[PDB]
Amino acid sequence: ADPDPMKNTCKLLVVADHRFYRYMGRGEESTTTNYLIELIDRVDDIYRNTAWDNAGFKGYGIQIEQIRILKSPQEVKPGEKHYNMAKSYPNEEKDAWDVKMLLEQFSFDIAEEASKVCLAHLFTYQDFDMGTLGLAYVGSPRANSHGGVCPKAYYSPVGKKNIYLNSGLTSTKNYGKTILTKEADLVTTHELGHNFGAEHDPDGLAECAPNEDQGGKYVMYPIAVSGDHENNKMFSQCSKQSIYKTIESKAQECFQERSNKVIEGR
Ligand SMILES: CC#CCOc1ccc(S(=O)(=O)N2CC[C@H](S)C2)cc1
Ligand SMILES: [Zn+2]
């Protein structure tokens, strides 16, 4: 099983909510798309150059298919919620949503567009409790996988539609501060890594959680350790095992060819 050039790319829906647009894009479309285009490039760089078998099974990446920028809050009726509404949920005195509820709701609301891509990712700007930066559904090689890349849908009778949990989100706000772009690069790489089927690197396995004087942790380590060490922008063998099986299984199904189109999504 070696890479198919016509199926080596996971096409991505990128969504920026009004909070990201206002604070990170400074309320400019141009600034917003520039920031996201460059972040996905840097994330893709990590992925393409990763050899999941440590041999030559590499060149798998991600490419933006759509950048959906929501320029104001979603109008809502009493009772209703929407991942892009003005207030945070379920507690509107907090800066941020409950982050699990946010991913669930983003997944529900963005379902029509998520059905058309390998992954959908929300970019937002809020301070989640406990210093959380991202969250994503974990992929799997299982034929009946219901999360991450190329998942099976859950049907929503109330929504009269299929819901796909091929989703995740990143916040570039933490403890009231905008994070460094190189920190943001890592979080999104981490959240996408779950989608591709990796769990956290266990602090147990030293070869998957090397000490600082050993080159530092790999990207799927569940704490944002300060300073930049070599391993930070690499996938551990623990991650590589999981992600390799997942790709090998799912790429034929919903990966595409690398392209540089004039217009995406037509
Ligand atoms: C800098 C860097 C890096 C590696 O990426 C991370 C992403 C999310 C987190 S987190 O704090 O949000 N944690 C709770 C949920 C998520 S998926 C893991 C911690 C680290
Ligand atoms: Zn994680």
- DSSP-assigned states of every residue in the chain: ----GGG-EEEEEEEE-HHHHHHTSTT-HHHHHHHHHHHHHHHHHHHHT--TTSSS----EEEEEEEEE--SPBP--TT---TTBSS-SS-TTSSS--HHHHHHHHHHHTHHHHTTSSEEEEEE----GGG--EEE----S-TT--SSSSPPPEEETTTTEEE---EEEEE-EETTEEPPHHHHHHHHHHHHHHHTTPPPPPSS-TTTS--GGGT---TT-SS--SS--GGGGS--HHHHHHHHHHHHHHHHHH-B-----SSS--
**Closest of 44, 14, 40, 39 to residue 181, by C-alpha:** 39
Cβ-based neighbour number of residue 5 at 10 Å:
9
Query: Ligand 1: does its nearest atom lie under 6 Å from the Cβ of 186?
Result: yes
> How far apart, in whole angstroms, are the C-alpha atoms of residue 147 and residue 13?
16
CA 139 to each of CA 11, 86, 144, 145, 260: distance values in angstroms, whole numbers, following the listed order = 15, 31, 11, 7, 27
Q: What is the resolution of this structure in A?
A: 2.0
For a pocket test of ligand 1, which of 100, 123, 129, 133 has the largest count of ligand atoms closer than 8 A to its C-beta? 133
> How far apart, in whole angstroms, are the C-alpha atoms of residue 24 and residue 218?
27
According to DSSP, the β-strands at 134-136 and 167-171 are: antiparallel
> How far apart, in whole angstroms, are the C-alpha atoms of residue 173 and residue 192?
18
Tokens of 254: 């919903």
Is residue 191 part of the annotated active site? The answer reads: yes
Helix pair angle (29-48, 181-195), 10° resolution: 60
109, 83 in Cβ contact below 8 A?
A: yes
Q: How many domains does the chain have?
A: 1
Give the ligand 1 atom nearest the CA of 179: 1
121, 14 in Cβ contact below 8 A?
A: yes
Tell me how the structure was determined: X-ray
> How far apart, in whole angstroms, are the C-alpha atoms of residue 200 and residue 193?
9
> How far apart, in whole angstroms, are the C-alpha atoms of residue 33 and residue 208?
34
Query: Ligand 1: does its nearest atom lie under 6 Å from the Cβ of 135?
Result: yes
Query: Binding residue per annotation — 190?
Result: yes
Query: Ligand 1: does its nearest atom lie under 6 Å from the Cβ of 117?
Result: no
Whether omega for the bond prior to residue 210 falls within 30 degrees of 0, making it cis, is no
We report the CATH number of the domain holding residue 138 as 3.40.390.10
Give the structural domain span for 164.
Answer: 1-266
Give the ligand 1 atom nearest the CA of 133: 12
Residue 242 has φ and ψ, to the nearest 5°, of: -60, -50
Whose CA is closest to atom 6 on ligand 1? 187
Cβ-based neighbour number of residue 216 at 10 Å:
18
Tokens of 180: 């460094």
**Closest of 207, 230, 211 to residue 219, by C-alpha:** 230
Query: Ligand 1: does its nearest atom lie under 6 Å from the Cβ of 134?
Result: yes
Which residue do the tokens 């999360």 mark? 147
For a pocket test of ligand 1, which of 121, 128, 132 has the largest count of ligand atoms closer than 8 A to its C-beta? 132
With a CB cutoff of 8 Å and minimum separation 6, the contacts of 243 are: 52, 193, 196, 197, 198, 235
Query: Binding residue per annotation — 146?
Result: no
Calculated CA dihedral for residues 104, 107, 108, 110, nearest 10 degrees? 150
Ligand 1 centroid distance, CA of 262 (Å)? 34
Q: Which of 65, 80, 183, 191 is catalytic?
A: 191
> How far apart, in whole angstroms, are the C-alpha atoms of residue 75 and residue 134?
25
> How far apart, in whole angstroms, are the C-alpha atoms of residue 7 and residue 76?
40
CA 241 to chain centre: 19
